[PDB]
Symmetry: D2
Subunit: 331 residues, 4 copies
């Protein structure tokens, strides 16, 4: 008789379906930053890793597995075959197109659409009742792409959007005032990138409107130039890529935070990208970041923020752009 | 329009069942010590409290409910009715017969059976696929009672047993050697109480057999009298009960540790009460503590500890006692 | 040679001062809820318990000790003598008379003033650089008493204040809007009691002013009666005491939350009782809850919350109330 | 009047040193894996990064700082100048030279000695009371190097040693037996690398000696080939490097586990590299992995494992080889 059989008597052989499984698609810096943030927040009873490069994937899986003693996630799996993702509660797409040197914006988006025409159906086939969290950039448009291809209802297709943008706003707001980011409140909404909207009205410490105190907050006659905070937020990624080549930990921590709200059904509010037709004067099938309530059904609700004429027109101008690009995409 | 509807757009009202629900039956010191431990280890997306005293029950629920801002458990419910326990993954029974000043063990058990004849069928009705963790004393006998009434297979009926007895053993072992209890290894097996078997052969730090180093370990010849460590484990509950009237924190943390293993499907080894028929020449339907592997199907496997002839006789003698009581019970 | 000597080589004899030591004065339901909450949030490397009931005190220490296997706080000690508190960063005062059914917090003044004349000098003697977190009621005045007796600067004397009352406000706010309390922002200021001030002008989800959407909010002509939310916050403790005899869990989590911000130097904004002289035209040495920044030096700064003529008047009344009681005290 | 001074009333601009400061030297994959693991286990109130690559260093700093909202470490600083390390409790060294294809072992060590001759005195200058944790390879020798240059007593100079090796040994046990690593007890001692000693005698689940159940375990005629488990431990790093190009997460988690034991004074037993002269007939100043007790003074004690005559010879040969190298180094 075997040592295991001498040591252990077996009552039950057949294991059940995993109950709290998460898949991360793509094992780049962002993918692995999400996985380690998720593994150390104990959100999953099973982690699945998927990417097209077999050796990198098995490597990252074995490195995580070797740390098992220091973790509470008892099964970590990987493969190029999406059968490993079976029965995921949450699937996080970080996989994208490696940006070519002299291509157009439209080229980059359509190469990502071609990768998504493979990933999304494979995700749906093995985890048809899962929430999709789109991290891959450009996040607003690729969240529309994931939506169309998957055929999922709008509540179960979520773009990481202005979540990290808003977390960076609160960090900078915190450094200017000597207050921890947690107690500094402020919202970056609309299109993730240069044309995002800082909501100066909702920007507050302890429910004290910085706009009410300082009427010229966020204007050009602003002597304190608080515009430069949103300018810093919107230029942050560029500055970090400049220095270390990429961004890793901040997005990893922010995606783990979103996963926590989903997996534990918290109904916390996050500024994430959601199909926004019929709201803020938008009449096209586009995704924009607004405060969304995240739980086990994904975006169950969203907050209808009051916006100035300027801010209304900026969200509408971002939608014009996104719809413009989206009708040129080949599905 | 309501402030809520002016503020929030609803995507879907559709509500779902609890995904990681735990129910604690009994809101005495032990039951509430399980609740706060479980609540502060983020093991559940929903917690249900059930006891017979409705005001006490609504007090504890409300007191926990007010801590929500500082918790990651979005739903806390309570009720006399077991419809609030519906869809529980794990159900912990702390409720039981109040110990009469002087009476036989045959009588004390039978008064607990009459209680489990109401508790267990209700639990089974609203949560048919759940795992039962029996904490109520005498834990070994009342785990057999739960098994019989429920009709559940032996894998999904677990008694806390010698799990805390072992935590105490490893704490005291730690004080003697000045090492953390985590790095002190020792096993209390068999019947929870005075008759429990301390396995001296398995007592070690860093895999160094103390029994080999000190052959007298656990004998009456022992110069350092290590039999006192097990004696202290056996008399620990008595000594604490004498000082603060009961035990709370140690059993709450130990059950939460069991709950972690079950809910997160860790597959750790805890010494818990399990149907031990066929093992150690035991011929009767008795439950005793042996090292069991605990996951999302409860006891998947148990460890066959090599015991001395003396150690076997003590387990067989405990089985003759418990079966002697059990066969004279009325269901 | 002993088994311990045969097993372990000693390199150095213990020559180390406590580094992250929290003391809890009082082993009542409040004290032990603070204790377990702090132990399960890994905030301290030494927990010292002090009270006047030597049996109860030793029984609680032993019960915490018996679950050290499941904790990362290696040294738990107790004793009626305050030399156990030596070299504490944070001493949490929960000892003294607690509210009986329907009894005001302002009816515990003279009893707990006497108890603070014993406790505070003893604390100061053994930990003269420690931060005082006052929890005993009436907490606002007893914080002022702790300040006067200790001679400590106002930054190192903190009261639990409206931290829990504010936590409760956001919980009930959350049950109305179907959002997690974490995403529901709103401040209860002034006395931790019946005279507390709900600042309607600061209440927001995602920086959207509820007062601006719903101008009637918190007035008698409000058809949704949002004033009943603040009423519930005031009545909350009375309700819980009536239902289970005391409040323990929620204040334990509220206090561990304040302990986290202090011990980890977060500089988070908490509504805690501090010396409010010079602000809102208050001239006396009054202690009220206003939003404060909490770190390892305690209250480094506070937020000047903008109040409506109505709000400011209602806070000056809460101030007047407490100067009336404070002015006639003996030291 | 600036917005900040309109919003916030300052009491205390007086500032103090951090209390639980950790410094990570080297921002490679290993140092940054330690950084995130330490940040996510809330072990520090200040994290200082120090490397020679100023752009990469500032890049990694900013990437952690942007995730501060999701962290409880309020100050993260970076610089080439070791004045950012001032008042560190624990300084983790991951910086050093990688062996070149032709390079002799002696020459590689001497290149690290020259690097350490700048790093260690700079560390000692700004944190003279700190614990050194040497992760840089070859770990056993560079712990000796760091010890020589620092002038520190042997308790405050720790090599990460066989901590991960042993953690890998317990994973491989776990998969073979279908148990969590936490419940699988095995020890890898001596020189970190292909000469490491797997203590077959100390191999157990629930204190059952596997060597005793299976007499042939760890020998050549072992029908189950358990010797192959140690071979896997010794090759697993080479196999992971071959697949993903380096080792990252498992060493980051393993190091954070040691940081927990030190920063929180747990006194857990870890296989870490310590000055071993006087044990197993070792006459020379060599550092080898033995099971050591780790607290806030580092190695306070160490466990003397009973080894077979064969096993003592393997440590004795490791010592001789290590002294062959160290006696030839230029300090």
């Amino acid at each position: 008789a075997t040592l295991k059989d001498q040591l252990i008597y077996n009552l039950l052989k057949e294991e059940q379906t995993p109950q709290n499984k998460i898949t991360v698609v793509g094992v780049g810096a962002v993918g692995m930053a999400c996985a380690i943030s998720i593994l150390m927040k104990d959100l999953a009873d099973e982690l699945a890793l998927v990417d097209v490069i077999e050796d990198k994937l098995k490597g990252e899986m074995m490195d995580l597995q070797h740390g098992s003693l220091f973790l509470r996630t008892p099964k970590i799996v990987s493969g190029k075959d999406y059968n490993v993702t079976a029965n995921s509660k949450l699937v996080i797409i970080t996989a994208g197109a490696r940006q070519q040197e002299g291509e157009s914006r439209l080229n980059l988006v359509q190469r990502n659409v071609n990768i998504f025409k493979f990933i999304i159906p494979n995700v749906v086939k093995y985890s048809p009742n899962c929430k999709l969290l789109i991290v891959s950039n450009p996040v607003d448009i690729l969240t529309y792409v994931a939506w169309k291809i998957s055929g999922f209802p709008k509540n179960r297709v979520i773009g990481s959007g202005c979540n990290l943008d808003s977390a960076r706003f609160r960090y900078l707001m915190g450094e200017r005032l000597g207050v921890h980011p947690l107690s500094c409140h402020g919202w970056v909404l609309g299109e993730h990138g240069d044309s995002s909207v800082p909501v100066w009205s909702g920007m507050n410490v302890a429910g004290v409107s910085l706009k009410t105190l300082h009427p010229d907050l966020g204007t050009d006659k602003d002597k304190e130039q608080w515009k430069e905070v949103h300018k810093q937020v919107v230029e942050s990624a560029y500055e970090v890529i400049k220095l270390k080549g990429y961004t890793s930990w901040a997005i990893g921590l922010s995606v783990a935070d979103l996963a926590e709200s989903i997996m534990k059904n918290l109904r916390r509010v996050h500024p994430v990208s959601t199909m926004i037709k019929g709201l803020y004067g938008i009449k096209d099938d586009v995704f924009l970041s607004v405060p969304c309530i995240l739980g086990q059904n994904g975006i169950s609700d969203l907050v209808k923020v009051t916006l100035t004429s300027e801010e209304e027109a900026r969200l509408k101008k971002s939608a014009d752009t996104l719809w413009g690009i989206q009708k040129e995409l080949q599905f």
